[PDB]
C-alpha cells in the first residue's frame, strides 16, 4: 500500500485472476488424453503460470484494484519500500548496456576515421577490431568519465553549421 | 661453485654460497638467497631460530630425562606442551609482560647492531664496560664470551654451532609433529622406538591412526 495499492500476495483479485487463467487452461486440458503430447504442454503451461504467480507474489509487487502488478518508478518510494528491482535496478542494468553499445560504436568509428578510406570498413566491418572493441569496452563508464575530464568526449566549434 | 662440501656431492651450486657464511653446503634449492640483502637477514634468522631451538631442545629433553630418572621437582613429569597450564608464583600474564619487556630491550639492542655493526657495544648506565670492537652481527663476544673462546679456530666453532642448531631446529619440529600425532612425551617416543624398533615406525603409527 504505497498509493492506494495492495501487495499481490494480499489482494484477492490477483488470486481470482490466477484461478481464471488456470480455469481456462483446465477446461482446455479436459479434451485430451492425460499422457498425450498436447496435455504435457498444457500442464507445463500451468506450471509456468503458477510459478509466475508465485514469483510475482514473492517479490512484493503491488497490485491494484484490477489485480495486476504495478511498478513504482520513483526512487525514495522504491528504495524506502523495497521496490528498487521494479525500475531502479533495471534503469542502470539498461544504461550499462546502452552506454556500452554507444561506447563500442563510438570507438569503432574513431578507430576507423584515420585510415585510407573509412567507409569501406563501415559496410564491411573489421571483425578483429570490432571484437577487440567489444571485449575492451566492458569498463565504459570509467573510460567515459576519464574522456569527459579531458574534453576529448566533446568536439569544440570546429563543427559544421549554417548561418547563425 | 667450488670444492666446498655439498649437500648433494656432484650437482651444481648457485655460487652465492661460496663459504663466507658459516656452515654452508649450497642447500638452497628454492633460490631464496639471490639478493644478498635477503641473505644477511636469513643468516641472522637462522642463528636466532637455531639458538632458541637449541635452548628449546635442551629445555625439553633434560627435564624429561630427569623426570624419567626421577628427581623431586615441583614440576617433574609435566609435558612441555602442558607446562603452560602449570601454576607458578605468578599468573602467566605477568610472566608474558615481563618477557615482552626484557626481550623488547634485548632484541632492539641486537637489531641496532644488525643495522649498524659495532654501534651497540657500550652500556647505557655503566659507560665504562664495552664489548671489544670488530665484532660481526650474530656474534657479539665480550661478556657473551666469558670463557675465553673464539680466540682461534672460530670458523670451525661457527660451523659446529650452526650444525647443532640445524639439528635442534629439526628436533623441535620433531617435538611439534611428534607430540601432535601420538600425543606423548618425545622421550617416551624414543622409549617405544627402542622397545620394538620395527613394530613402530612412523608409517605404522600413521596407518594405525588412519
Amino acid at each position: 500500500d504505497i498509493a492506494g495499492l495492495t501487495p499481490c500476495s494480499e489482494s484477492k483479485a490477483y488470486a481470482k485472476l490466477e484461478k481464471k487463467e488456470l480455469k481456462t487452461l483446465e477446461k482446455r486440458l479436459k479434451q485430451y488424453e492425460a499422457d498425450s503430447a498436447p496435455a504435457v504442454a498444457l500442464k507445463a503451461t500451468m506450471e509456468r503460470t503458477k510459478a509466475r504467480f508465485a514469483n510475482y507474489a514473492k517479490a512484493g509487487l503491488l497490485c491494484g484494484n484490477d489485480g495486476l502488478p504495478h511498478l513504482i518508478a520513483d526512487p525514495g518510494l522504491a528504495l524506502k519500500y523495497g521496490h528498487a528491482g521494479e525500475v531502479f535496478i533495471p534503469t542502470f542494468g539498461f544504461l550499462y548496456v546502452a552506454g556500452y553499445i554507444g561506447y563500442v560504436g563510438r570507438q569503432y568509428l574513431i578507430a576507423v576515421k584515420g585510415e585510407a578510406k573509412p567507409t569501406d570498413k563501415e559496410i564491411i566491418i573489421d571483425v578483429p577490431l570490432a571484437t577487440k572493441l567489444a571485449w575492451q569496452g566492458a569498463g565504459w563508464p570509467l573510460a567515459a568519465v576519464q574522456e569527459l575530464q579531458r574534453g576529448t568526449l566533446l568536439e569544440k566549434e570546429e563543427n559544421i553549421t549554417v548561418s547563425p | 661453485d667450488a670444492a666446498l662440501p655439498s649437500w648433494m656431492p656432484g650437482a651444481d651450486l648457485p655460487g652465492y654460497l661460496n663459504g663466507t657464511l658459516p656452515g654452508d653446503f649450497g642447500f638452497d634449492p628454492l633460490y631464496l638467497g639471490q639478493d644478498p640483502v635477503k641473505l644477511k637477514w636469513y643468516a641472522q634468522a637462522e642463528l636466532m631460530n637455531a639458538r632458541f631451538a637449541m635452548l628449546a631442545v635442551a629445555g625439553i629433553l633434560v627435564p624429561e630425562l630427569l623426570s624419567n630418572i626421577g628427581f623431586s621437582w615441583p614440576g617433574a613429569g609435566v609435558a612441555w606442551y602442558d607446562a603452560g597450564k602449570f601454576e607458578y608464583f605468578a599468573p602467566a600474564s605477568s610472566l608474558f609482560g615481563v618477557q615482552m619487556l626484557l626481550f623488547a630491550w634485548v632484541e632492539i639492542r641486537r637489531y641496532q647492531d644488525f643495522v649498524k655493526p659495532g654501534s651497540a657495544n657500550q652500556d647505557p648506565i655503566f659507560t665504562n664496560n664495552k664489548l671489544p670492537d670488530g665484532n660481526e652481527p650474530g656474534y657479539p663476544g665480550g661478556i657473551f664470551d666469558p670463557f675465553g673462546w673464539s680466540k682461534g679456530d672460530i670458523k670451525s666453532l661457527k660451523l659446529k654451532e650452526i650444525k647443532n642448531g640445524r639439528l635442534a631446529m629439526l628436533a623441535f619440529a620433531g617435538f611439534i609433529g611428534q607430540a601432535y600425532t601420538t600425543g606423548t612425551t618425545p622421550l617416551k617416543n624414543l622409549s617405544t622406538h627402542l622397545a620394538d624398533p620395527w613394530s613402530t615406525t612412523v608409517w605404522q603409527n600413521d596407518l594405525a591412526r588412519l
Partner: protein
C-alpha cells in the same frame, strides 16, 4: 645535545643542538621544516606545563584524601556541592563553565596571538632564576624533562583508569601489595590473550 635516545643512531639535521630537551628523537621527521619546529617547540613546553599541573592535581587529591582525579568532576551529575580543600563551592555547572570559557580566553588569547613567546622574562619570574646568562638551558632542560615525565604520567593515568577503573595511588598500592598479580597484564584489556 646531551643524549641520543637510541645509541648508535644519527641525529637529524633539523634539530638544533642548543635547543633544550634535544635528543634527536624525531622518527617521523615530524618537525623537519623550521616553522613547524618553531610551533612544536612552543607547544611541547605548554603541554609539559599543563601536564605537570595536571599530575600535581591528580596526585594531591589522593595524597590529601578527597577522592581522585576522575570523580572530582562528578558532582555535576547526580547532585552537586563541589569541594576544594574541604571548602564548599556554591556554583552550578553553567556558571563556572562560562567563567572558564571567558576568564581563560582573556589569558590564552593574550598569550598566543601576541607573538610566539614561550619563556617570557619579567613578571613570570618573581624570584629570579632565568637571567639567560649561564643557567638558562639547564633549567629549561629540567623543565622539559619533568614535563615529559608528567605527560607520560598523565597518559598512564588515563590508560590505568580506562583499564582498571581505579586511581593512581589506589593501584600503585596494589602494585606494591601484589607485585606479580597487579600489573598491566592481569587485567583482560592491555594483554589480550595471556
Amino acid at each position: 645535545k646531551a643524549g641520543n635516545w637510541l645509541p648508535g643512531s644519527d641525529a637529524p639535521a633539523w634539530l638544533p643542538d642548543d635547543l633544550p630537551g634535544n635528543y634527536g628523537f624525531d622518527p617521523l621527521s615530524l618537525g623537519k621544516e623550521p616553522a613547524s619546529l618553531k610551533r612544536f617547540t612552543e607547544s611541547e613546553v605548554i603541554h609539559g606545563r599543563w601536564a605537570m599541573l595536571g599530575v600535581a592535581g591528580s596526585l594531591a587529591v589522593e595524597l590529601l584524601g578527597y577522592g581522585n582525579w576522575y570523580d572530582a568532576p562528578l558532582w555535576a551529575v547526580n547532585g552537586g556541592k563541589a569541594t576544594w580543600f574541604g571548602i564548599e563551592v556554591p556554583f552550578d555547572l553553567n556558571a563556572l563553565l562560562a567563567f572558564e570559557f571567558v576568564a581563560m580566553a582573556a589569558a590564552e588569547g593574550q598569550r598566543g596571538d601576541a607573538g610566539g613567546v614561550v619563556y617570557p622574562g619579567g613578571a613570570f619570574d618573581p624570584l629570579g632564576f632565568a637571567k639567560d646568562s649561564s643557567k638558562s638551558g639547564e633549567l629549561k632542560l629540567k623543565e622539559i624533562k619533568n614535563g615529559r615525565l608528567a605527560m607520560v604520567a598523565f597518559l598512564g593515568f588515563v590508560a590505568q583508569h580506562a583499564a582498571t577503573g581505579k586511581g593512581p595511588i589506589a593501584a600503585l598500592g596494589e602494585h606494591l601489595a601484589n607485585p606479580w598479580g597487579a600489573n598491566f597484564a592481569t587485567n583482560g584489556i592491555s594483554v589480550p590473550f595471556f
